[PDB]
Design a protein around this nucleic acid. Sequence first.
DNA 1: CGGCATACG
DNA 2: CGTA
DNA 3: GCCG
Length: 327
Amino acid sequence: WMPAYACQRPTPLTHHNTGLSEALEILAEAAGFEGSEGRLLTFCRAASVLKALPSPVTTLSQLQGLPHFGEHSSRVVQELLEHGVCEEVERVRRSERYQTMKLFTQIFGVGVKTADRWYREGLRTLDDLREQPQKLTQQQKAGLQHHQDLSTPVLRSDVDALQQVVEEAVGQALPGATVTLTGGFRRGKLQGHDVDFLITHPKEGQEAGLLPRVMCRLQDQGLILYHQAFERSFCIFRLPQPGSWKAVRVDLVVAPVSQFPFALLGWTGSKLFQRELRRFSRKEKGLWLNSHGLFDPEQKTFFQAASEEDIFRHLGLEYLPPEQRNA
DNA sequence: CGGCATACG
DNA sequence: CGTA
DNA sequence: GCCG
Ligand SMILES: Nc1nc2c([nH]c(=O)n2[C@H]2C[C@H](O)[C@@H](COP(=O)(O)OP(=O)(O)OP(=O)(O)O)O2)c(=O)[nH]1
Ligand SMILES: [Ca+2]
Ligand SMILES: [Ca+2]
Ligand SMILES: [Ca+2]
Ligand SMILES: [Cl-]
Ligand SMILES: [Cl-]
Ligand code: NA
């Protein structure tokens, strides 16, 4: 009854197994910090299964027959059910390796590979990094200077004012171009670590060269604290605050209107949902999906889509609104 | 055992 | 390498 | 770590 792919089931934002899913996601994160992407995926998938259940897991028996629950994830749930804590999870939580890899990977411009190298070099704190800044990229210097502001969640109540400033710049760059809020906010989240906007124009081709024009205008308005032809921009924006402002991460993405449903799907997430959707497409339907299109490699054709609904139908999946893609 | 999503900057 |  |  519980299908194996997260794109085959509704996953709401809030659910009935929060504590169990959070513990599995700690182990998933730690697996990623060690480069074990397969174990990260299994732990992420097991957590996601619990998010999709209709009521709390109260006894181990209820894991029987659920996909992605083997001996390891079942033992994690078992210990939480019996003692309220999982020793493995707590050992990870307080480990110096986990805490420092988390601290470092949270910096904009630092990935797992860089954080791991720093860890092996003996670095442990943000002040350790600030001491020899010539070792940092320009992106990493920005991420480090802005780290405190970037560590505070963006509120959905901040987003509308920001969307209006982006829309003004976009409308000057290309009258008729539109801005769509994507990411976790579109899935219903009340906060997020960054804001995501998808930009298009109803006349195919008119969006060509648009993003530099947008960025130049936003920069001239004094709103860009950091930015790098292009179609994705990963920025730090000045967001107004009472008597002041704060730095917020903002992603801007441009797509032609022909690709807009695919880009909207991809950027609306969740990350696990998109990975599972692309895996399902490829492995179950023989179709190749990304944020630009859906390719039939046998007939060498791209599927036209006018809506997200179209894409779910192409793939033979029941339609899920964004609020049920919180895998 | 092989596979694990798939892009752009 | 970083980013989504 | 788990599925097929
Ligand atoms: N972060 C991230 N997002 C990805 C990846 N691959 C992929 O398709 N995405 C898509 C799905 C994400 O939900 C969407 C937006 O990315 P995001 O990091 O802003 O995630 P979010 O809005 O869901 O989360 P948040 O800001 O509330 O923390 O981009 C990836 O590797 N990392
Ligand atoms: Ca099982
Ligand atoms: Ca976001
Ligand atoms: Ca983002
Ligand atoms: Cl592995
Ligand atoms: Cl893509
Ligand atoms: Na990072």
